[PDB]
Symmetry: C4
Subunit: 84 residues, 4 copies
């Protein structure tokens, strides 16, 4: 469902934010965004106060969306695929 598009837009947004503000290469910016929203958290934190502030809000807004997608992918695509 739209979940796929909403997640991609969210990651694009994060990728744009962290390339600009934190000065990261897109792939690193997208990486950061992904591991942050999935709560994995394996990179170091944002160095700038604006990066911190954004990440805070990005987490509260982005996580439900990203885990809604991961959820539907699982019990909606992966489950029946496996069961075959």
């Amino acid at each position: 469902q739209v979940l796929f598009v909403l997640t991609i837009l969210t990651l694009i947004s994060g990728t744009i934010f962290y390339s600009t503000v934190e000065g990261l290469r897109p792939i690193d910016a997208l990486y950061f965004s992904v591991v942050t929203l999935t709560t994995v958290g394996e990179t170091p934190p944002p160095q700038t106060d604006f990066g911190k502030i954004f990440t805070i809000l990005y987490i509260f807004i982005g996580i439900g969306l990203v885990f809604g997608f991961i959820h539907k992918l699982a019990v909606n695509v992966q489950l029946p695929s496996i069961l075959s």
Copy 2:
């Protein structure tokens, strides 16, 4: 619902704790609190034993509250907004 206020009070509490005990700038203290309670965990750990102890309890008490909020925000605000 009250979830919004309870979460903010919890983050204020964490922000006060980590500024005092760990000696962090508020924004860093609030950052720590947020990434801890959301289980992202991208900063280094608390350096003081009191920081450790507090974080342990702060996690067990704070996480259910913070994820209750993130949950209601998603399936209560974000979902219908998207569906428009």
Copy 3:
């Protein structure tokens, strides 16, 4: 419920393991155990292969228990307390 005791036994176990095997001070060992099982993950990883192996199994066994507790604490203690 027993959840409280099961969680404490699990943390005691982790505290004993990581003091011995990784050579950590109890409080650090307990800290590690807690942030690992809550999936926060803010310390560095175990340095020993036995620490790695144990952590893998400790995560698969411990997490459901620890989040069962955090869950009951929330929708069973915190929720009605707040609603007062």
Copy 4:
């Protein structure tokens, strides 16, 4: 259920990927895979762009599976075992 096998295949896959691409010792590769898919995230991130890209997809595909397993283990094996 198959969950056990699907999880092991997923970790084997991650173990193979990270030994090859990132140049890690199997046990380290498997460790990385496990803490990534459980969202603990305590090691440093992948250093290679291919490691980053793979991890992104590995997270979206692997997490639902790994947490489906952890879930069934809990409310299906651990719960009744405890209740005895």
